[PDB]
């Protein structure tokens, strides 16, 4: 979530993703902790015994066969953490994740209910206003004239500067707003 995906997944990343998914489905089958630990050590032994492959064409073939085996032997209802997608509590508080710009449309009475918070909000707004021009200049400088471009973003590289496009990251709503 906090990192952007690359153009393609390398072979090592595909193998590690398969290993983690296989362990999760193995725990979904095993339920009990001791049984899960036994069969997870067996799965780790399988991955270790196929680890040192040098041809890499046979390694891709083994990865394909292992993926076929996983799709044949996966749990129909694997365990999902509640906050994870497909879980029971996933996107539950999106109805409460109100974006911060409605305080701009708040009435002066409602602002008068919270004086100090709105003063600090104005300070954040002024900081954003200066940093926007600074970071637009930085992003224009940092952009390659031609070639390969990814979704990664530069940090602040000088004193008294903020990272570009920091507003929607820093001022995002909390995961438990209430």
């Amino acid at each position: 979530a906090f990192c952007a995906p690359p153009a393609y997944l390398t072979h090592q990343q595909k193998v590690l993703r398969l290993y983690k998914r296989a362990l999760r489905h193995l725990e979904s089958w095993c339920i009990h902790r001791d049984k899960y630990r036994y069969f997870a050590c067996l799965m780790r032994a399988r991955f270790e015994e196929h680890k040192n492959e040098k041809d890499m064409m046979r390694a891709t073939q083994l990865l394909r066969e292992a993926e076929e085996e996983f799709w044949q032997n996966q749990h129909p209802q694997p365990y999902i953490f509640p906050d994870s997608p497909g879980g029971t509590s996933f996107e539950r508080y999106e109805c409460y994740k109100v974006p911060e710009w409605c305080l701009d449309y708040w009435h002066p009475s409602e602002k008068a209910m919270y004086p100090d918070y709105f003063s600090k909000r104005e300070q954040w707004k002024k900081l954003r206003m200066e940093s926007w021009d600074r970071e637009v200049k930085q992003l224009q400088e940092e952009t390659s004239p031609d070639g390969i471009m990814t979704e990664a973003l530069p940090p602040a590289r000088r004193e008294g500067d903020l990272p570009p496009l920091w507003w929607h990251i820093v001022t995002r709503p909390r995961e438990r707003p209430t």
Binding site: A7, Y8, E68, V136, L139, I148, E151
Partner: protein
């Protein structure tokens, strides 16, 4: 012991054979797709985090999709025998079918009522 993909149950992106037999052309195509995605993302994020923005962000993709779904269809329509037959069937066949259904039902009802064989027990408000 094999997963058979369907239009409604597609092939996994980890089970398709095209993933394991990769080519440098496919790799550079994926890199170019990531480059296009990153350029669009950078433009959208600049427009999104600009504080002087006082309006919503327009989506030309959404505008194109709505225009293609609404106003481009008749400019891009050409009469072919296949769509002529499809339009004739989809515009008349249900009408003729329900015509024969209702005509047969009401003819049977009128015949039963005229020969007295249909009994109206308490039907007073029709």
């Amino acid at each position: 012991s094999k997963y058979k993909p369907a239009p409604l149950a597609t092939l996994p992106s980890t089970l398709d054979p095209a993933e394991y037999d990769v080519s440098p052309e496919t790799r550079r195509a994926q890199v170019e797709r990531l480059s296009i995605r990153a350029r669009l993302k950078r433009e959208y994020l600049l427009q999104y985090n600009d504080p002087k923005r006082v309006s919503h962000i327009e989506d030309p993709a959404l505008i194109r999709w709505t225009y293609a779904r609404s106003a481009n269809i008749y400019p891009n329509f050409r009469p072919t025998p296949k769509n002529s037959l499809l339009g004739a069937v989809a515009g008349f066949g249900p009408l003729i079918f329900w015509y024969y259904v209702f005509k047969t039902d009401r003819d049977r009802k009128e015949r039963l009522i005229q020969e007295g064989k249909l009994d109206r027990k308490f039907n007073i408000s029709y």
